[PDB]
RNA sequence: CCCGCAGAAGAAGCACCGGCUAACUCCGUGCCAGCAGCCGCGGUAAUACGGAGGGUGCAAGCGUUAAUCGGAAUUACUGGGCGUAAAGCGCACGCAGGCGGUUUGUUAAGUCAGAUGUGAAAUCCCCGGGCUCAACCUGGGAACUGCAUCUGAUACUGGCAAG
């Protein structure tokens, strides 16, 4: 029941499938009695540097108030999944729902 | 004669026989009572080129509406499943 | 002077990118506080935020990628 | 940086003992690109000097306009002298449409999508600042909340 | 032959808010006190009051924020010369909804905002912005 | 129904690269590109607003090899389509089959692409297509037929297409003469200098 | 402009009829020439302009400017009237069609070849 | 109930029959005013009870002469 | 429709280039000859006439004329004005007609909400499908802004009664 901040990239070739992953993450967190504080998709923004060749990955933001274990299963999903690259998770002090 | 017959609504060399409840004394493509289905002799592989409306055409033929030879062949063709 | 002692900012948000474009020189290096006049309270959490944004590749490590 | 653009240059004249003396008049508009515009009208005996006086006057008596992100906040009509102006906010998928005289003063403002039509007199000198009227009293919901209470 | 008390009183608002007077007065009727209450609710008039019994008068007082008047564009729409009647969904949004249109609907009088969420139109009175 | 005249006149009028040549020679060496063609090319333009809008339209039409009636129909379709009509026009323009052949580099120029399409030489989803203006849907496999396969034309085309920017919305297979139109491109990919809003204004008048 | 006045009588706009009664608005007519004239123009211009007075098969009789460098039209010839109004000459509102029917095209013309009825030379 | 309609009787001297003003208060299509427009309806009755100064309720019936396609069923306010 | 033969071999014109409006120089002519949609060009140094070169715009089409809408808010319902630009009858009464102070009660015509029937199909729009694509053909939906009926609301107007 602590506040976390997730940003994850998607390989550009699976851009059409990303809201399904988003819904599946929200379904899992609501089943684990977590909630969503902000969800917004950034499109395919241009990278500063190519990673595993490529450019213009699909950026996704999320703010989650959650127990730790379901998030831990979530990073294991990010590691196992190849359609996701370059994930990053974060602690924040309180819940946040702002712009940018 | 209230009947059910065919109207070539397609183009030159590409027919589309809209099968319609029409009075027989009218023109083939003009006045009618009401559309019931369509046939396509030049249809693609995905079998959507033929459709009817079974209970409505049953209502007309129970009302006394005759049918033509081609639509008789097509009701024999759709049968119930194939 | 320090821009962040104005505006009452609680913490520098790493997803705020245009401000970091102003505080990162064209090489990609973090500027010293001795030039900007930023308070060291906010310089530390600032440079952390560039290191976060760099991980997301919103900011380049260098101009030779 | 404030996006100087010429609108129309005209030749006017004065009659004296010697005859006619012609003088050049230039109209221009400046503004950064977000809620900041100012028009200038300047005359000189030569064209480049005329634009120089006009734009130097334009970098003066600027006026502020309350916008949305890229558009107007409500329909407004702008009436000055003989010119009449009508303008609407437009969708983000729309470009900005107006007369050539209005395109400069709207483009330097930072709107990208305005439905704008000129009625009647369409001289540039009155059509601009017929546009500054209307933009001078564009109104925001927060400001009318300050007016009323909600 | 004064033939529109509502137009008369709306012009009392216009003249008072032009000459920056604190109060305006006019004779009284139920349509006037209703639209006065609507202006009260939407914050264009901060006090209205009904006095008298043999000849009832209405006194309204006026709002000024930075010296300039608060209401800036008030216009009667549906006139004795021409009547305007509007159904539920074609009700307008004054100044893209920033201003208001006051309307006399079948269940009473309210603004366009209240009428459109209650799902009924009617004899539209005037625009205020 | 195609220009079939001198291309560097067009490039020399536009002042920039219109990508109408293979690229094996420097453009400045091939033509003296800095001024317009003809006797009076060296003078100042002082070009009008209608002039610059016209020049941008002429530029995009001469890049994509499209005539006015077709490109007008492209505008009508783009304005018909939802979204930003300005990049909708470019999205329709990038769906052309000869444009696809050039973007995968099966032709040294888009004129080679057009000739190769017209000469019954591209197999698309197992169907050969003679139509140069054929609109390509996403997830489409295009291929070169067994005829004209391993021809010096397409070999040199690939070997001079390796030096390009390798577009992200296509998958290339240079050993099998196969390609995949995976997505329609976006405006951010394409040359960064097409001023589509000028075409929008010129046709809105 | 009051609504009751407009209910009593609606808005009435004049038709502002056509500049040419070439009749039934036909793009061309054919006619028999009454007489070739050579006429002086309006004040700012000076010329000896070649005009024809022609009797239409409709029945109307009007003037038609004879365009181009020279012409070989004589009496009773049948020509094609087109339209288009000439501002130097008051009273004429029409043009002939060169190269059509009895009217010959302009001799040895190279540019603007179509509008003066000349065949394309060998090149 | 049956399709019925109401109106002012204008004629009086009409033999076992009557003509009625049918006012309709309709909006103008262009200039928007609700204008008083009336029509005359040529109506049947037995032994000629009603007269001028009356409002009557009529129904469309089968033709009895030309235009004669209404019958009155009810009479109200039979006074000046 | 699919395959094979031969070789670039059998296939490019039209209008325009003074401003409006993208494209300019030379020669001939010299208020002549002529152009011209409006402004206007031409009377011996014409980017406007004619020819050439060059350029521009379209393209198996290209121009002119013809016709209708728009731009024209230039008949202005949306959306115009009447001191001097065109416009207040010379001035009054005055029937019809348009509008009308203020409350109560009634009615529900106008008005407004809902429901039903209907507004042929085709056409337009949108999501699909097929002709190598397109035009074209075509499924479904949406619309058809209408009319009529019936049930309700009575704030305002209209009607009535009482002040």
Curated annotation (Swiss-Prot), chain D:
Residues 2-65 form the S5 DRBM domain. Keywords: Acetylation, Antibiotic resistance, Ribonucleoprotein, Ribosomal protein, RNA-binding, rRNA-binding. Pfam families: Ribosomal_S5, Ribosomal_S5_C. One of its GO terms (cellular component) is cytosol. GO terms for biological process: cytoplasmic translation; maintenance of translational fidelity; response to antibiotic; ribosomal small subunit assembly; translation. Disulfide bonds: none annotated. The N-terminal domain interacts with the head of the 30S subunit; the C-terminal domain interacts with the body and contacts protein uS4. The interaction surface between uS4 and uS5 is involved in control of translational fidelity. Part of the 30S ribosomal subunit. Contacts proteins uS4 and uS8. With proteins uS4 and uS5 encircles the mRNA as it enters the ribosome, which may play a role in mRNA helicase processivity. Can be cross-linked to mRNA. In collided ribosomes contacts ribosome rescue factor SmrB. Altered uS5 proteins have been identified in a number of mutants. Some mutations in uS5 have been shown to increase translational error frequencies. PANTHER family: MITOCHONDRIAL RIBOSOMAL PROTEIN S5. This is Small ribosomal subunit protein uS5. It comes from Escherichia coli (strain K12).
Swiss-Prot record, chain E:
PROSITE patterns: RIBOSOMAL_S8. Keywords: Repressor, Ribonucleoprotein, Ribosomal protein, RNA-binding, rRNA-binding, Translation regulation. Gene3D superfamilies: 3.30.1370.30, 3.30.1490.10. GO terms for molecular function: rRNA binding; structural constituent of ribosome. It comes from the Bacteria. This is Small ribosomal subunit protein uS8. SUPFAM superfamilies: Ribosomal protein S8. GO terms for biological process: cytoplasmic translation; regulation of mRNA stability; regulation of translation; ribosomal small subunit assembly. PANTHER family: 40S RIBOSOMAL PROTEIN S15A. NCBIfam families: PRK00136.1. One of the primary rRNA binding proteins, it binds directly to 16S rRNA central domain where it helps coordinate assembly of the platform of the 30S subunit. It comes from Escherichia coli (strain K12). InterPro entries: Ribosomal_uS8, Ribosomal_uS8_CS, Ribosomal_uS8_sf. Belongs to the universal ribosomal protein uS8 family. GO terms for cellular component: cytoplasm; cytosol; cytosolic small ribosomal subunit. Part of the 30S ribosomal subunit. Contacts proteins S5 and S12.
Swiss-Prot record, chain G:
Changing residue 87 to Q: Confers low-level resistance to streptomycin and a 15% decrease in the translational elongation rate. PROSITE patterns: RIBOSOMAL_S12. Coiled coil: none annotated. One of its GO terms (biological process) is translation. The keyword Ribonucleoprotein applies. The modification N6-acetyllysine is found at residue 107. InterPro entries: NA-bd_OB-fold, Ribosomal_uS12, Ribosomal_uS12_bac. One of its GO terms (cellular component) is ribosome. The modification 3-methylthioaspartic acid is found at residue 88. The keyword RNA-binding applies. One of its GO terms (molecular function) is structural constituent of ribosome. Keywords: Acetylation, Antibiotic resistance, Methylation, Ribonucleoprotein, Ribosomal protein, RNA-binding, rRNA-binding, tRNA-binding. Part of the 30S ribosomal subunit. Contacts proteins S8 and S17. Interacts with ArfA. May interact with IF1 in the 30S initiation complex. At least 19 substitutions or deletions in 11 codons can promote streptomycin resistance, dependence or pseudodependence; all but one of the streptomycin resistant mutations (K42R) are associated with hyperaccurate translation and thus reduced translational efficiency. HAMAP family: Ribosomal_uS12_B. Belongs to the universal ribosomal protein uS12 family. With S4 and S5 plays an important role in translational accuracy. This is Small ribosomal subunit protein uS12. It comes from Escherichia coli (strain K12). The gene is rpsL.
Curated annotation (Swiss-Prot), chain H:
CDD domains: Ribosomal_uS17. One of its GO terms (molecular function) is small ribosomal subunit rRNA binding. The keyword rRNA-binding applies. Part of the 30S ribosomal subunit. Disulfide bonds: none annotated. The strain missing both S17 and L29 grows very slowly and has a rather unstable temperature-sensitive phenotype. This is Small ribosomal subunit protein uS17. PROSITE patterns: RIBOSOMAL_S17. Keywords: Antibiotic resistance, Ribonucleoprotein, Ribosomal protein, RNA-binding, rRNA-binding. One of its GO terms (biological process) is response to antibiotic. One of its GO terms (cellular component) is cytosolic small ribosomal subunit. InterPro entries: NA-bd_OB-fold, Ribosomal_uS17, Ribosomal_uS17_bact/chlr, Ribosomal_uS17_CS. Signal peptide: none annotated. Coiled coil: none annotated. One of the primary rRNA binding proteins, it binds specifically to the 5'-end of 16S ribosomal RNA. Also plays a role in translational accuracy; neamine-resistant ribosomes show reduced neamine-induced misreading in vitro. Belongs to the universal ribosomal protein uS17 family.
